[PDB]
Amino acid sequence: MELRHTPARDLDKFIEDHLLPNTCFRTQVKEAIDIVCRFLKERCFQGTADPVRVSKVVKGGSSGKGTTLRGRSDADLVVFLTKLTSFEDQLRRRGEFIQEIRRQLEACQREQKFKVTFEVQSPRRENPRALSFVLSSPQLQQEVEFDVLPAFDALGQWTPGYKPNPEIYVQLIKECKSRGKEGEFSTCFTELQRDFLRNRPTKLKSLIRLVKHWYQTCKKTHGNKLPPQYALELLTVYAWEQGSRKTDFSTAQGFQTVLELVLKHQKLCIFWEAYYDFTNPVVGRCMLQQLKKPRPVILDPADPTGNVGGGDTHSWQRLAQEARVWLGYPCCKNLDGSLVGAWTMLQKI
RNA sequence: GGCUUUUGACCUUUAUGAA
RNA sequence: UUCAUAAAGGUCAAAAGCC
Ligand SMILES: Nc1ncnc2c1ncn2[C@@H]1O[C@H](COP(=O)(O)CP(=O)(O)OP(=O)(O)O)[C@@H](O)[C@H]1O
Numbered sequence: 001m002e003l004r005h006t007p008a009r010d011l012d013k014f015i016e017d018h019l020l021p022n023t024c025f026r027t028q029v030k031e032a033i034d035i036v037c038r039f040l041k042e043r044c045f046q047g048t049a050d051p052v053r054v055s056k057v058v059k060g061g062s063s064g065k066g067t068t069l070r071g072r073s074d075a076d077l078v079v080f081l082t083k084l085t086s087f088e089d090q091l092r093r094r095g096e097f098i099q100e101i102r103r104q105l106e107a108c109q110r111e112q113k114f115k116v117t118f119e120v121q122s123p124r125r126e127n128p129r130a131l132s133f134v135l136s137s138p139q140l141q142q143e144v145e146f147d148v149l150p151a152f153d154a155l156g157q158w159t160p161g162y163k164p165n166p167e168i169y170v171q172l173i174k175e176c177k178s179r180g181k182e183g184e185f186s187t188c189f190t191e192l193q194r195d196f197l198r199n200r201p202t203k204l205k206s207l208i209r210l211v212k213h214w215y216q217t218c219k220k221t222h223g224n225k226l227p228p229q230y231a232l233e234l235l236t237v238y239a240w241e242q243g244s245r246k247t248d249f250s251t252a253q254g255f256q257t258v259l260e261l262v263l264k265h266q267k268l269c270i271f272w273e274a275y276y277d278f279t280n281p282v283v284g285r286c287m288l289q290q291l292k293k294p295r296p297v298i299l300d301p302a303d304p305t306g307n308v309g310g311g312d313t314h315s316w317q318r319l320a321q322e323a324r325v326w327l328g329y330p331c332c333k334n335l336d337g338s339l340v341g342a343w344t345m346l347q348k349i
Numbered sequence: 350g351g352c353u354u355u356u357g358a359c360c361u362u363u364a365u366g367a368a
Numbered sequence: 369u370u371c372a373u374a375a376a377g378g379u380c381a382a383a384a385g386c387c
């Protein structure tokens with residue numbers, strides 16, 4: 001049945017039956033990703049006399065994190081290009097490389113290698129960050145949607161578990177402040193975003209799937225007037241880190257905890273020191289400034305300039321109205337009708 | 350306890366692109 | 369050598385579903 005009719009003790013069964021990827025979906029998506037990556041490395045940029053080269057194509061998003069929803073999660077690919085040499089360079093020339101990727105895709109389509117359908121683009125967006133399309137192929141048993149983002153390799157060859165050289169963030173901050181573009185270059189650090197989730201406990205990822213499904217259900221009512229989905233993913237990590245830190249926990253208690261955190265968005269000030277910290281005075285000052293913003297502040301662990309909170313209080317107002325409604329559903333209720341109870345939050349300093 | 354899936358960790362290999 | 373995407377082999381763990 002639907003999530004809103006599902007009692008607390010059946011949440012994990014709901015996640016299993018509807019949210020966890022099945023073998024065909026994830027294998028088909030991987031096959032499509034291989035198709036696109038091979039295209040990006042072996043065909044797409046071979047047209048130019050001055051070799052533009054792909055240093056890496058990173059599978060980011062839920063696909064790289066292992067937090068996908070069965071049959072509903074896209075493939076988010078950040079394609080790093082050697083010719084993009086700075087954040088400035090990325091901001092101004094990403095449109096060029098986007099159009100060229102589009103051109104070569106359409107070229108391959110004519111050759112009947114595969115079929116591509118490009119997104120609505122209702123707003124001009126001014127300067128898009130992604131090339132969004134649906135991929136069809138004779139080898140594929142299903143369509144797969146893609147977000148392809150050209151980017152400057154700010155991190156270089158990155159070691160998992162290594163803190164980035166703070167000078168990289170110093171440069172990021174300079175460029176953002178210069179152009180008034182905070183949060184603009186998160187794509188450069190998608191590896192850090194992925195790394196922040198990739199090795200988390202299996203059940204934490206299942207809870208994230210649940211919250212993401214809840215979020216998408218709310219999207220039915222409130223359209224696109226909600227806070228970023230990524231904000232809810234980070235809020236769930238926060239809930240677990242302050243309230244559980246265990247591999248085995250109650251899914252229902254975690255879910256209620258997140259719903260209650262949404263209600264307290266006016267008091268949320270969340271950040272991490274996973275990839276940066278207050279040691280560097282420039283980075284520390286940037287972090288401090290973000291932490292002084294109107295609530296909620298949910299700072300991207302990968303990007304000290306990115307408040308994933310979004311800065312739109314109306315968006316959190318609407319989400320909280322849904323959180324209030326859902327706290328009355330069977331989801332967080334025991335068999336006797338009582339709430340399972342949220343986690344006791346430990347104060348993080 | 351048994352079966353399986355999902356999610357990672359570690360060690361190898363191939364194709365491809367890069368440094 | 370390293371990094372990336374897919375595939376192949378091996379080991380380890382976590383959670384879940386079912387019995
Ligand atoms: N507001 C934001 N600020 C910074 N990074 C963001 C962001 N929104 C999305 N991202 C990054 O881009 C990735 C892909 O975004 P989306 O594809 O829109 C949702 P997702 O996290 O992949 O889950 P889903 O695609 O299964 O719904 C996210 O995982 C996140 O790393």
Ligand SMILES: Nc1ncnc2c1ncn2[C@@H]1O[C@H](COP(=O)(O)CP(=O)(O)OP(=O)(O)O)[C@@H](O)[C@H]1O
Pocket residue numbers: 060061076077078125128129130147148149185186187188189190193
């Ligand atoms: N850092 C990142 N890593 C991986 N994927 C990302 C990413 N940032 C963005 N994406 C993907 O690329 C898509 C388009 O990127 P953007 O143009 O930045 C979203 P937007 O136009 O600001 O609309 P929004 O208000 O929904 O965020 C996102 O929906 C996301 O799926």
Ligand SMILES: [Mg+2]
Pocket residue numbers: 061062063073074075076
């Ligand atoms: Mg995605």
Ligand SMILES: [Mg+2]
Pocket residue numbers: 061074075076146147
């Ligand atoms: Mg996407």
Ligand SMILES: [Mg+2]
Pocket residue numbers: none
């Ligand atoms: Mg596996």
Ligand SMILES: [Mg+2]
Pocket residue numbers: none
């Ligand atoms: Mg090789």
